[PDB]
């Protein structure tokens, strides 16, 4: 009931989603660890 993702799920602080391949990357990375696309 209260285990719904909207209530309990959150992403790491500063995390960014690669616009090219959707991999989730560290705030400290300038480029995607998988496909090398640069952070926006």
């Amino acid at each position: 009931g209260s285990m719904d993702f909207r209530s309990v799920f959150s992403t790491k602080e500063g995390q960014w989603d690669c616009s090219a391949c959707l991999v989730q990357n560290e705030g400290s990375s300038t480029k995607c660890a998988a496909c090398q696309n640069p952070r926006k």
Binding site: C21, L22, V23
Partner: protein
């Protein structure tokens, strides 16, 4: 705002039906992304669970698997995998350990589902007794037919349960799937389901 999502790598020999399979999910096909640096199509597949939506971002090759291993970037940050073979081609089943080795080498103990595709075809060569005889611990197996949507949701539900750590997780509705191109014969499905159950329980 944030949405639960996982990178899923779909691997297995060329011609086993990987691309046909991922494409059954209609919205994943219309929203797919082409990754030029790696020659990959990433299909964002949403499934609606009793706890909300989850997205499997499925990595489908552009055929390079025919010419040796895939590059590391294909595997990097994978959170789960499907290994596919073709139940009409014993060679594709014999290569399963090789894909499994490559996966663990880069991704260690991520959850993996093994899928035997094309079970709609009557002249089946890799049968349940052989698949169960070679069953690997933690390597969950399903019969699938991409072309008929047969068992489409099962690999994803099993992985979701493992990733979330919730054995009671359910899909509340099926995704919108491309209409079946071939009929999965009901008598054949019932036989294969029986053969699997027998192999899994027989002493």
């Amino acid at each position: 705002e944030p949405q639960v999502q996982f990178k899923l790598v779909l691997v297995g020999d060329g011609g086993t039906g990987k691309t046909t399979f991922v494409k059954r999910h209609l919205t994943g096909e219309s929203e797919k992304k082409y990754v030029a640096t790696l020659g990959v199509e990433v299909h964002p597949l949403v499934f609606h669970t009793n706890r909300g939506p989850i997205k499997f971002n499925v990595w489908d090759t552009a055929g390079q698997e025919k010419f040796g291993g895939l590059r590391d970037g294909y595997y990097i940050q994978a959170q789960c995998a499907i290994i596919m073979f073709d139940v009409t081609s014993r060679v594709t089943y014999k290569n399963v350990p090789n894909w499994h080795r490559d996966l663990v080498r880069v991704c260690e103990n991520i959850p993996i589902v093994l899928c035997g595709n094309k079970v709609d075809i009557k002249d089946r060569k890799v049968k349940a007794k052989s698949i169960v005889f070679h069953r690997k611990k933690n390597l969950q197996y399903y019969d699938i037919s991409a072309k008929s949507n047969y068992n489409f949701e099962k690999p994803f539900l099993w992985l979701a349960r493992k990733l979330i750590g919730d054995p009671n997780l359910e899909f509340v509705a099926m995704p919108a799937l491309a209409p079946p191109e071939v009929v999965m014969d009901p008598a054949l499905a019932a036989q294969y389901e029986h053969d699997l159950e027998v192999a899994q329980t027989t002493a």
